[PDB]
Symmetry: D2
Subunit: 334 residues, 4 copies
């Protein structure tokens, strides 16, 4: 099996570990974080939104034992010091939020890992990959790769159908987002100077920036510059919805045509549903994006139309399932 190390055993690190248990060909041999084994084992076993871990977890000498398998743990904040060469690490899943750039994540390679897959958008000379939208741009020789964001993974399959079938002129996005760990429990100073992420995450509708639409061109070059938008973070602990309002080249577009084109593009990353679901129904799903045909709207005034659509994602598990798909493909290629 391909030997995987997880840097940052956080929400995405822990869910990625869970997901790897169920993909033949991949094995997590080491995790790194900023805490002790008592805490790491505990957070794997118990999960507020994603539920109890299936098998058994026991703290052992150099880390913890998950269903018979030993996993080594470390507490090394500076990634260049990690014993990656000695552990023969093939790929590092970079999930800390502190190495979101090609040169920063290069620290893992210096430590002896063959490749790095980052669990967020990242700056620098690197590929940004949404599985089943643009993973075929990987060739196996890449050393540092981005897995895009949760919002990008929800958006890209949708935007791609809109453009291929109808011709995208322009569009604006609003993502209605579960609150995340970069927000405060109570109003307090925010480390990044963000006066809105400073506010009590679970008591507020909180506007915030995102680059998912603005930077879509990294994933779909032919629509680069044609989208923008933002986020509204709201008090659900996981599960999100991307709403996209577009102008198209095709004229007299109907709801039926838009829904049908989306259904026709469905696969393991891109879901399709006509059920009147709500956000808790997407908790733990493995679709990168779940297109919801019940929310499609076409506004027509004379010859001029706006098309609006919406796709659900579990910002946690949807993204994680996409990340682990891209992980296996990157390993496959080499």
């Amino acid at each position: 099996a391909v030997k995987v190390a997880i840097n940052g055993f956080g929400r995405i690190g822990r869910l990625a570990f869970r997901r790897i248990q169920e993909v033949e060909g991949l094995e997590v041999v080491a995790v790194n974080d900023l805490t002790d084994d008592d805490m790491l084992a505990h957070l794997l076993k118990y999960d507020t939104m994603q539920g109890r871990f299936t098998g058994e977890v026991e703290v052992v000498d150099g880390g913890f034992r998950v269903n018979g398998k030993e996993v080594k743990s470390f507490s090394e904040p500076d990634a260049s010091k990690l014993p990656w060469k000695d552990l023969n690490i093939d790929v590092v899943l970079e999930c800390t939020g502190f190495y979101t750039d090609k040169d920063k994540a290069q620290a893992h390679i210096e430590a002896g890992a063959k490749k790095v897959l980052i669990s967020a958008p990242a700056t620098g000379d690197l590929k940004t990959i949404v599985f089943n939208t643009n993973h075929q741009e990987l060739d196996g020789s890449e050393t540092v790769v981005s897995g895009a964001s949760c919002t990008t993974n929800s958006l890209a399959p949708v935007a791609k159908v809109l453009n291929d079938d109808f011709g995208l002129v322009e569009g604006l996005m609003t993502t209605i987002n579960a609150y995340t760990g970069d927000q405060n429990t109570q109003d307090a100073p925010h480390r990044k100077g963000d006066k809105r992420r400073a506010r009590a995450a679970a008591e507020n509708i909180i506007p915030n920036s995102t680059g998912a639409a603005k930077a879509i061109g990294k994933v779909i070059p032919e629509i680069d510059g044609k989208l923008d938008g933002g986020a509204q973070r709201v008090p659900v602990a996981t599960g999100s919805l991307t709403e996209l309002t577009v102008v198209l080249e095709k004229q007299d577009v109907t709801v039926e045509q838009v829904n049908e084109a989306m259904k026709n593009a469905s696969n393991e990353s891109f879901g399709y549903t006509e059920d009147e679901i709500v956000s808790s129904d997407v908790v733990g799903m493995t679709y990168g994006s779940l297109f919801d045909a019940t929310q499609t709207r076409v506004m027509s005034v004379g010859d001029r139309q706006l098309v609006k659509v919406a796709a659900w994602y579990d910002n946690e598990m949807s993204y994680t399932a996409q990340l682990v798909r891209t992980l296996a493909y990157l390993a496959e290629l080499s």
Copy 2:
């Protein structure tokens, strides 16, 4: 003398309307009707989860409750036409039950003796739909049954009016991000109206749902009839809401700055303006019908083709209630 008001439905809107009326001279709530008893009516006025403790003294007496010494008569009658409005010389009934959102049905109050009825919601039939400081001057005194429009309508109207007047509205789509309300279930359970989404645990979900606010904007602003549509996303905050509007405009080369300044230029007691990075809890209890947020203004340009996007905050409770009460005073002032 003071305009004599009766509140039908001492719920969220009715109780807040009562509180707001204590702050406004010339209006007096003389009577309250609901489906409960005085112990409960008094308690719910005294204590309010989102809107805070009531400022005054509340005391249960025979026939109702005393508020700062002033007697309020209470009744527990579901059939509006049975109410003693003649004897109490009612001038306007604030209709906040959710069960009389129609011209003919609301006529029950007039039969019972009231002069006028103001309905706390959109309403069917041959009546005017009013957002204070957008189209309240369309009222001419002849009206006996009026709609105060919806919370979402009151947030949207002044925004849409500026967009159209200054830039020419071609078309647009709205999404409103809404506090959950009493027509939703606490736990996943069958829903009275067969709505499979309002059926779900209100404070645990992002819940899509319909709204007539954009579709029916033509009733408040005729010149844009049919040019807006949209929907809601109901989320787990107990009050406070945000309206996002994405539009196509006639004027070309529009900028963020131009839109913001135009919004600011139209500000008043109903239509507020802010450049502060506020969140939903900051508008709880505010008395603006709509609070434009200049920080959320965006412009997408691809060649000569633009989308323009704006957002205005509203406390679906106090924003709407403050507007409802301005319309009430105006509508009663026309009778004199």
Copy 3:
């Protein structure tokens, strides 16, 4: 298989349905509520806290199809008008909350059902059963039985051990409960005139009465009149905790003896944990009561002691698993 009808397809009724899916010898042939089949099917499929229905559901003619089997559905508020005679109903699971009385529940018997199991405490001379505490008091000649409350199923096995091993003098219970459907979404008149249940469920700590401790005599006669207490309903949508503070006859009681006696009494209804869990970790669990050893406390001043303990329960699934165990045992008899 035993033919079951479910009256009230609500939180308990739907979860009992799910649970009944994995019990050979038990079959739901009919459901009754006050809504249409579309609503019923949808709420079976999708569940906010309990997750997606594991099988698959389809609306048909006079009810719905759940994995090959057909379930008849009705919309009859008056139970006496139900076709229980025609459908040969062996047991009605009474989950509406409107028939919590021996004589009231008799309507199902007149309608042609053989037995009624009520999913709550109920008045009149009938047996109140907590599975694995007193289900052997059933002899199979009973026509109407109560499955007790959620709190009673959490409290009974705890209380039994305390009395058996230490002798109960007297105690007070406080349960910290998930909010439930008898509460309002927003501050509003309450149907039962309760000025606390009238308040916004998910935005408050709400004190409220409970008859679980006061009526513990129905399940464990030897401690009748020895317990009382109340509830504090808080904003978690399911998952609850019972705390009990007692005076005991035995002297010099220690935390360790208490915990050891609980672990010794453990079974499939009464679990034991030394993990530092929180409420979301018991969501979906199948124990009626999970004793939490980390929460045991002993106060001593001279020879005088207060002993305190706590046990988790998913007021939803914990109760439901217990109700379905009682259903199967009750049905096995005549």
Copy 4:
């Protein structure tokens, strides 16, 4: 003439302390220290999710920020000993960071040049722990570092005292059901202090946790040292909490009426009394250190053997803060 206060840690307690001090004559906040900039400090003072908007004018100026024509200097210095307290003539530091909850560590402020330190939390080392209107009279003017106790301790002490004074306290156990606080994570994550329970999503769980409030009550009421213990359940409300106390007493044949009356007679500006069926949102912003709720009094009698339960509300924020600022003024007033 004004006493010069510096607040170290402009957090939940630090900010509300600032607000409170605006009602106390002869007390002025001249300086604030934290880990951020004036943009952020000014914004968090203006807008408050649970306690509501600050009404005064706040603007960012060169040395810090200006509040209603009064200047406050701000710093961004994590090391208390490096603060310019001597230059600023600081009389008392209100230590609200959570990082100096120890006599010797808090000494850094004195070395920095502050005359006194009042810590907004329980604190280790050789110092007094003070609940205003329970034991503030213990202060004799020569204290250099003082603890203002915990929120729970302030809710508990006036209750424990009445019970002992009027009934003779044998022993008791406590559960406090608490609003979640900033020492908890928004989502399940490693916890900085290794606490596997505070590690969990604060707003989605009932979370058991320790509290020294009952166990360390002897520092406040010496005559009941060692007679109380208990813990906490942290639940998803953002502020507002309740202390439940179950006790055995020496006085026999005790009634709910005797207990409630004893509590009422003891009531003052620190210890409130209610017979209303309130919930947690009703105490948000209250200024009682403790609000006794007579509706929750219970007496369990089996033969001649009794258990007595009582319950007192507190806003863990404003109740505690109001108590801290009372102890602040009294401490400042000593030696004058």
